[PDB]
Design a binder for this molecule. Structure first.
Ligand SMILES: Nc1ccn([C@@H]2O[C@H](COP(=O)(O)OP(=O)(O)OP(=O)(O)O)[C@@H](O)[C@H]2O)c(=O)n1
Ligand SMILES: Nc1ccn([C@@H]2O[C@H](COP(=O)(O)OP(=O)(O)OP(=O)(O)O)[C@@H](O)[C@H]2O)c(=O)n1
Ligand SMILES: COc1ccc2[nH]c(C(=O)O)cc2c1
Ligand SMILES: [Ca+2]
Ligand SMILES: [Ca+2]
Lengths: 224, 209
């Protein structure tokens, strides 16, 4: 029970930026990977609370207090509220970077006219505010902040050169890059610790992936 | 088994228009209504093909030919390949009306997005039949999604949609509008009963033909 006596808060799923009651803007996270690690935590003795975004269809993990949100701002409101109680923070949510400038209260009808263009307004970075909040002494309880990253690589640089920067810019303790697995085929794995450790993530299932991460988390709490 | 020897084509769920590998634009359909009709359809003897977009984790109906799609262009092309074989088309998919002007092949690293309209598949099916490309098509069904405003009721707007679209039946959400001008109400029973009233209403038409 390596995680006995730990209150752990995790975010999972992808957020939806409404355009109107029906249309919206999204990121392609199923949420399964985030659910998978919270489930392991509960297994290792951890006190888990799950903020989940649009992951319905998935079954609620046993022993985990669940809270549901929809927009990316609804996430920030949810995270801010439960955060000063948690010992560990895990942000496996694919949070939307932007949202429509205005939301109509009703459906927008399809016209025979040059389809207009959607202007955008930036959403609050939840993980960056939490590093600041702790840094400002607002988190006496927080012992661990874990991020998740997706990188493909550009001609600026590969997938790996890109997330050493993101780890340095966001300032979290561990960063999981390219870490979602496959149970079906065609469905780079990299753990970046804050020590400069670049342990690679074995290609495998969501569970072994989820196990290695909590495995990587526990060690840190012991080093602390 | 009133639907013996009937080839039937169904769409259900929603489409997703890529922005890049990760971001996309969609709708909020469950797919439940369409899956329910294909299910009821199969029960009465139909050769069912389900072109299915985004759902809530729904399970593929059985005895149903399934086709899975993501974008709306993937749907149009999916419907076109399978259309000349069917005797009935049921267009319960919530199809995206537009898609991004540009799609990135890789992730966009951290404004305004320009848009392009998607071809209206149901309208393309209604005229296609009128033009004699579908001797096999005997019934074409649309589904209306209305919230309403000050220009009219959810109800009025969709009297317009029946005339603009030109299909055999239009089911509004619970109400059902025939091409006779027939206007029926749907009791909010189970989606299973709604789907039952619907196929019953579809069947009635094929005899009136
Ligand atoms: N490009 C599109 C979009 C809609 N659909 C179909 O057209 C019907 C009408 O649905 P609705 O979205 O309410 O009609 P729209 O013409 O898109 O009206 P609106 O202005 O509300 O968007 C649905 O069966 C849907 O499957 C379609 O085939 N072609
Ligand atoms: N508004 C946001 C966006 C992301 N994150 C967190 O920051 C990490 C970065 O995820 P990713 O989307 O891959 O990177 P971005 O922050 O979007 O940066 P970029 O656009 O450069 O890829 C993730 O753990 C995510 O949960 C967050 O909480 N706040
Ligand atoms: C945008 O980056 C992504 C893309 C897909 C994803 N899936 C999951 C998951 O929780 O399974 C997380 C996640 C993040
Ligand atoms: Ca992003
Ligand atoms: Ca539409």
């Amino acid at each position: 029970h390596d995680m006995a006596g730990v209150k752990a808060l995790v975010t999972a799923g992808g957020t939806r930026e409404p355009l109107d009651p029906v249309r919206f803007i999204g990121n392609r996270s199923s949420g399964k990977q985030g659910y998978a690690v919270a489930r392991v935590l509960a297994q290792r003795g951890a006190d888990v609370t799950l903020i989940a975004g649009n992951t319905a269809g998935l079954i609620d993990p046993a022993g985990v207090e669940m809270v549901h949100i929809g927009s990316a701002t609804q996430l920030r409101d949810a995270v801010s509220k439960h955060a000063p109680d948690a010992n560990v923070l895990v942000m496996a949510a694919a949070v939307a970077d932007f949202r429509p400038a205005h939301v109509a209260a009703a459906k927008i009808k399809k016209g025979a006219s040059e389809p207009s263009s959607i202007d955008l307004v930036r959403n609050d970075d939840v993980l960056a505010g939490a590093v600041r909040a702790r840094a400002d002494g607002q988190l006496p309880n927080m012992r661990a902040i874990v991020g998740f990253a997706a990188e493909t690589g550009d001609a600026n640089g590969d997938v790996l050169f890109h997330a050493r920067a993101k780890l340095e810019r966001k300032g979290c303790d561990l960063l999981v890059v390219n870490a979602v697995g496959e149970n079906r085929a065609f469905e780079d794995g990299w753990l970046l610790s804050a020590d400069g450790t670049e342990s690679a993530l074995e290609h495998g299932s969501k569970t072994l992936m989820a196990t290695r991460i909590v495995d990587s988390i526990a060690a840190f709490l012991k080093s602390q």
